[PDB]
Amino acid sequence: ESNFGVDFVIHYKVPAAERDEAEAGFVQLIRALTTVGLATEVRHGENESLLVFVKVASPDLFAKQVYRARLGDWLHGVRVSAPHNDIAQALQDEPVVEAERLRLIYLMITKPHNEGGAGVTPTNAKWKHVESIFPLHSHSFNKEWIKKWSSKYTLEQTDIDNIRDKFGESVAFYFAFLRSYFRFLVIPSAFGFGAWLLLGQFSYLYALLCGLWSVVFFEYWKKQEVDLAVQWGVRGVSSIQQSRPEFEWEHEAEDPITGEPVKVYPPMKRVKTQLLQIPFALACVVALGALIVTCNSLEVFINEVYSGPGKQYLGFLPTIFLVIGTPTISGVLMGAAEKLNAMENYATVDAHDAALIQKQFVLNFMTSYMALFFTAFVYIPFGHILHPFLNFWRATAQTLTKELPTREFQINPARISNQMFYFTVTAQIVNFATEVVVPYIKQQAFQKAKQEDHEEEAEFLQRVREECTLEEYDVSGDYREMVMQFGYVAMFSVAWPLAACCFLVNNWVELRSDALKIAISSRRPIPWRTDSIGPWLTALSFLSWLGSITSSAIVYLCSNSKSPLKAWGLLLSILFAEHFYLVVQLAVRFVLSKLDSPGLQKERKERFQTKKRLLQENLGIEHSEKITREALEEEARQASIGTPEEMFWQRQRGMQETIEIGRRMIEQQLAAG
Amino acid sequence: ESNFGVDFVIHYKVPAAERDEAEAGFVQLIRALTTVGLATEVRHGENESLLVFVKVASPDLFAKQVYRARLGDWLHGVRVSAPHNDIAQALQDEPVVEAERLRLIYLMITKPHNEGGAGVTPTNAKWKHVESIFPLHSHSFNKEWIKKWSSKYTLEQTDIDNIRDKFGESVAFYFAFLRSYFRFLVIPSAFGFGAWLLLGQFSYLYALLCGLWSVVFFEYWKKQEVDLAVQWGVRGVSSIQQSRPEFEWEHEAEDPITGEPVKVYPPMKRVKTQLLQIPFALACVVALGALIVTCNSLEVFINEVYSGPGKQYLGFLPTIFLVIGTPTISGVLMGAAEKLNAMENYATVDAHDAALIQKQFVLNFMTSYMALFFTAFVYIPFGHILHPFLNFWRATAQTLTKELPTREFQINPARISNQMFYFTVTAQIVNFATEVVVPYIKQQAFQKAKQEDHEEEAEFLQRVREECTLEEYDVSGDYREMVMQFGYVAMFSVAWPLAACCFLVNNWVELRSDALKIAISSRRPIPWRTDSIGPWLTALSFLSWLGSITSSAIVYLCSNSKSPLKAWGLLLSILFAEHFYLVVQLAVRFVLSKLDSPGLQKERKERFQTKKRLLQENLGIEHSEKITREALEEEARQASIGTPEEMFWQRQRGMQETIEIGRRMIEQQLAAG
Ligand SMILES: [Ca+2]
Ligand SMILES: [Ca+2]
Ligand SMILES: [Ca+2]
Ligand SMILES: [Ca+2]
C-alpha cells in the first residue's frame, strides 16, 4: 500500500558489456552512502539495473542534522524565526515536513564530499552509471489530493500549504501562482464578456482596461510573493543554493557577508558575455520569424488565392511544413543557447537553469506570436504588401503543376478571429490531450512490453520499477504555458474579447490537470527551494509592457477594416496607451506600497524582537540639585587655576536666582521706553 | 572668541503691551527647562527680548542620554553597529559629535512632555512668546572652513564628513549631493564642448548622450545615497522622527513592528485626498502657464513687431509685468497648496514638509521652463500660430497710443540661444549676487540701525544679538536651485551644448558659495537627520524622464529651421528617444546592481555577526556501527508485536552483506541473457 519508509531510490544502470567499472563503482557507491549515515538495501531492477533503497538510519542523528541546517539558514537571513534554544524541542514546536526531510537527504547524497556527506552527482562522471536519484510517491496521498481538489470550486491557502510540505516550494509556487492567476482572470472575463456584448470588436476602452489589469495583476503577484516567501521561510535563497562543479573561477577571496572563502568570478567579465545574447535574441527573431511568415505566406496562398484541386488537401501542407521545421530550427538555436550559457559561467545551479529560460523565451516568443503578429499587423491592416509573396507562390506553383487558376486577392478580416479561436479554444483542448491523455495512453504501450523476486515486497517493487521509467517533473515547463497564455490576454485579447472567458475555464482545469500530472504521469520532484517564480517575472513584465503597445496598435490598424490609416495616428495611439501604462504602473506601485504587507512585517517584527531579547539579557526637585552640584563643582575645579568662561555660568545658578534677574531685567528693559 | 559652552539659545520675545502672560510664561519656560536636566542663564536681548542660554548641566547624565538614544536607534534598525556593552565606553569607541549633541538637546527642549523632556514648541501656542530656538555658530571653525574649501580644487569625502559632525546630516547631504553633481557635470561638459565644436547645434547624437548621462548620474546617486546613509548611520529614519501635534487620528492600535501604541490614520483615506493634487497640478500649469506665455507673447510683440518710439524702453515692460505678477499668483496657489497640505494629515513632520515641496515643484516648474517651452515648441518651429496673439497687441496698442508702425513678423531662430544664455550665464551671476552679496550688504543696513550689559561678556553678547536677526537656513531652498539647474541640462541643453560648461564653473562656486551662506549669512541649522535628499529624487527622476522627450522634440522641431515638419516624424523621434531612455535605464540599473555595494555589505555583515555572536553564546568506521545498532533496535522493538515493513530493512544490514547480495544479483541478472 505504502512505501516502506523509503526516502530515496537510486537507479544505478549497469550495462552488459563494460561491467568492469559498474561492479567496482557499485562498491564505490554503496560504501560512500554508509559513511554519511544512511542505511541501504538492494533489489532487482527493471531489466539490467540495481535499485538501491536508502533511508536515514538513526533519527537521533537526523534530528541534529535538521537543526544544523535550520541554523545554517537562519544565519543567512533565510528563516525569519530562530529555532528554539532547547535542542530536540524546535522539532516539537514546528515539525519536520516531508519536503524538508527529503531535501536534507538529497544534500547528503549530492555534495562535493569535502563539506557534506558524499557525491552521487551524475555530472561528476565517475558516477556515470548512477542513472536517477528520485523519491517515491505517496499513493495514499495522491488519491486524496485529486479527490479533494476536484470536489471544490475554489481552492484555499491551506490547500497549497500542504503541497509546500510534500512537493517542496518550487512546485508549490506554481500552484500558488496558478491560483493567484485563475482568480485574477475573472476580471478580464468580467468586462471581456461585457465588451464582447456591449461594445464591438477592437474597442479602445477594452485596450485600456486590459492594460490596467496586466499591471494590477503583476504588481499584486510581487506583493503576494514576498508574503509566501516569508510564511514558508524561503526568504531569499538565491545566494544559498549549492554551486556548480563546472564553475570556473579566477581567484578566491573571502566573503564580506559571511567570512568563509568562496570562488569569485568578476561580474564585469560576465556582463561582457551576457551582452552577447543581444545578437542571439536578434538571430532568433530573424530565424524563427522567417519560418512562421513563410509558412503563413504559403497558408494565405492556398486559402485565399487558389481555385485548383484539393483546397482542403493542400491546406494542411503549411501546417505540416511548420511542425517539422519549427523543432529543427529551435533545436539548432538551443545548441547555440546552451553553448553560450556555459560561456557565461554561472555560479549557482539555480541561476544557470534560470538563464536557459530567458534564452528560450525568445524561441518560445516567436513560435507563439509571429503567427499573430503577421496577421494583425501585416495581413489585416495593409495586406497588399504580400503581392511579392503571393506572386512568388504563383511562380512556385507554375513550375510544379498550363496556367493554374488563381482568384483575386481580397483581405479577409475574419482571419484575426479564426486564429484567436485556435489559440484560445483548440490549442487549449489539444494541449490538454497532450499534457494528460497522451502520457496516460503511453503506459498501456508499456503494458504491452511486460522475475525471481520475493513475494512479500512484490507489489511494492512492481511499482518502483514502473516509477523509474517516468520523466522528472520539469516545473519550468508548466510555467511556460501560463506565461504564453498570459501573452494572449495582455497582447492580443483586444481582437477577441472572449479570450479571457475561455482561459478562466481552462485554468480551472489546469489547476487540477497539472495536479494530475504530478500524481500519475511523473515521478516525485526533488523538493527544491525558490524565493520567486524566477525568470518569469521578467517575462510577465515584458508581455505586460508589450501588451500596451501591440494591444493599442491592433485597435487602430484593424478597427478601420470594419478611412485610411495614417502613421501619425498610430504613433499617437501607441504614445498615449503606452504612457497610460507607465502612469497606471506608477499608481499601482504606489497604492500597493501603502497597503499593509504581512510578509515584511512578520520579518521586521522578529528582527526587532531579536534585538529587544538581546537588550534585556545584558541590561537586566531632586533633579535641580544635580544642576546645582555640577555647576558649583565646575567652579570648584577651576578655582585652583576660567575667567570669561566659567564665571559666565556661575552668576545665575539654580533657577530661583534666574527668575529674579529675569524679572528685574524686564522692567529695566521697558522703563527706558 | 568662542561660545561659552552654550548649547542653545532661546529668544523669548516679550512685548510692551500684553506682558501679563509673557512674565508668567517666562516662569513657565525657565522652570520647565530645569526639570529636564539643563542649566540656564538670562541676558539682555536686542531691544525688547530675553535671550536665555541653556547648556546640559552634568555630562554624567548626558552620557547616559546619548546611550539611551543610541539603543533607541539601534532597536529601530537605524544604526547598523550596536553600541559597546560597557556603559561609558562606547563614547570612547566612537565620540559624540557636535551634531548628535545638539540634536538630543533639541529633543529635550522640544517634546510633548509625556515621553521626553519638555515642550518649548512654538506651535503649541501656549509658548507663543518663544520666538527662536537656535544653536550658536563656531566662528573659529567657519574661518577655517572657508579657508580650507577655497584653497582646494576638488573636495574629499573627509571634508564632508566633518560637515556631518557639526551641521547635521540634512545639511551634509546637500554638500554631498553637490559634490557628486559637480563631478558628474564634467561628462556633459566633455562632449558638450565637443558637440558645440565638432557638430552643429541641435545635434541628435548629443540628445542621446545627454539622455544617457541623466540616468547614469541619477542611478549612481541612489547607489551613493545608501552608502552615505549607512556610513553615517542614518539608515531609514523616515519612520523614527517625531510626529506632529496637529496630526489628527481616527483610532489607536498597536504597532506590529514595535508593540507600542501609535496614532493611526488609515492610508486609503489619505490616498483619496492625495489624489486631489491632480486638479491642483493641472491648475498650476494653467494659471502660471497663462502668465508666462502672455508675458512672452507681449515680449515678442515689442521686439519683433514694432517700429515706434522707445523699443528699448518698452522692452523692459514685460519683464516688469512678470516679476510683479509671478509672486502674486504663486502666493495664491501656495495658499491653496498649504490649505491642501493640512488636509492630507501627514504623520511625521519630515513628511509634511516633503509634500510641500512636491506641491511647490509645479509652481517652480512653470516659472522656470514655460519661458523655454514656449520658445522651443511654439515660437521657433511654427510661430505663425501667434498671429492671433500678435494681432491682439496691435489692437491693444491702437487704443492706447493714428496707425502705429508695425513691421512684418519673421521667426528669429536665435531666440533659443538668447534665452539659454540668460538661464545659464546671466541668471547664474545674478543668482550669485542675490544669494551672497545682497544679504552681505543687508547687514550694513543693520549697521545703520545701531546697553547696561556686563563688560566681560560684551563681545559675546554683541554677537548673539546679531545672530538672532538672521533667518534659519532652509536647506530645501538650495536643493531647488540644483534641481532646476539639472533641468536645463537634461531638457534644454541640446539647444545650446555649452550649457554644461557654464554650470560646472557655477557649481564649483556654488559648492563654496553655499558654504559661505552657512557661515556669515544664516544662523546654524538644527541638526536634523534624513536618509535621502527626500522629494527631490522624484523631481530628478521626472526631469530626467522629460529630458528624453523634450530634448528630442527640440532636435526635430528646431533643426529644420537651420523641409517641412511632419507629425509622424516627431512622434517617431519621441518614440525612439524615449524608449532609448527606458532601455538605458534598464542597462544602468542592471550594471550598478552587479557592482559591489559597500553600504549594504557593511549592513549585512553586522546583521550576520549579530546572529553569529548570538549563536556562540548559547551553543558554547565508527559511523557504520551506528547504522547497525539502530537497524537491529527497530527489529528489536517490533519483535514484541512489522512483517512487510521492518522485515524489508533487516535483510541487508550493514554494508558487507549488501555488496554480497549486490554482486550476486549482477550475474543473476546477466546470465539470463
Ligand atoms: Ca493545458
Ligand atoms: Ca501546465
Ligand atoms: Ca547661485
Ligand atoms: Ca544654492
Numbering used by the authors:
A (entry chain B), B (entry chain A): 15 to 415, 419 to 467, 476 to 587, 595 to 652, 664 to 684, 688 to 719
What do the paper's sentences say?
For the structural characterization of nhTMEM16, we have initially studied Ca2+-bound and Ca2+-free samples in detergent by cryo-EM. By this approach, we have obtained two datasets of high quality and of sufficient resolution (i.e. 3.6 Å for Ca2+-bound and 3.7 Å for Ca2+-free conditions) for a detailed interpretation by an atomic model. In the structure determined in the presence of Ca2+, we find a conformation of the protein, which closely resembles the X-ray structure with a root mean square deviation (RMSD) of Cα atoms of 0.66 Å between the two structures. The high similarity prevails irrespective of the absence of crystal packing interactions and despite of the fact that the sample used for cryo-EM was only briefly exposed to Ca2+ at a comparably low (i.e. 300 µM) concentration, whereas for the X-ray structure, the protein was exposed to Ca2+ during purification and crystallization at a 10-fold higher concentration. Cryo-EM density at the conserved Ca2+-binding site, contained within each subunit of the homodimer, clearly indicates the presence of two bound Ca2+ ions located at the position originally identified in the X-ray structure. Instead, it is likely a consequence of experimental conditions, which stabilize the observed conformation of the protein. This is in accordance with residual density from the headgroup of a bound detergent molecule at the upper part of the lipid translocation path found in both datasets, which might prevent subunit cavity closure. The Ca2+-bound conformation in detergent and the ‘open’ class observed in the data of Ca2+-bound protein in nanodiscs both show the widest opening of the subunit cavity and thus likely depict a scrambling-competent state of the protein. In this open state, α-helices 4 and 6 are separated from each other on their entire length framing the two opposite edges of a semicircular polar furrow that is exposed to the lipid bilayer. On the opposite border of the subunit cavity, α6 is immobilized in its position by the bound Ca2+ ions, which results in a tight interaction with α7 and α8.
First structural insight into lipid scrambling was provided from the X-ray structure of the fungal protein from Nectria haematococca, termed nhTMEM16. This protein is part of the TMEM16 family, which encompasses calcium-activated ion channels and lipid scramblases with a conserved molecular architecture. As common for the family, nhTMEM16 is a homodimer with subunits containing a cytoplasmic domain and a transmembrane unit composed of 10 membrane-spanning segments. The lipid permeation path is defined by a structural entity termed the ‘subunit cavity’, which is located at the periphery of each subunit. The ‘subunit cavity’ is believed to provide a pathway for the polar moieties of lipids across the membrane, whereas the apolar acyl chains remain embedded in the hydrophobic core of the bilayer.
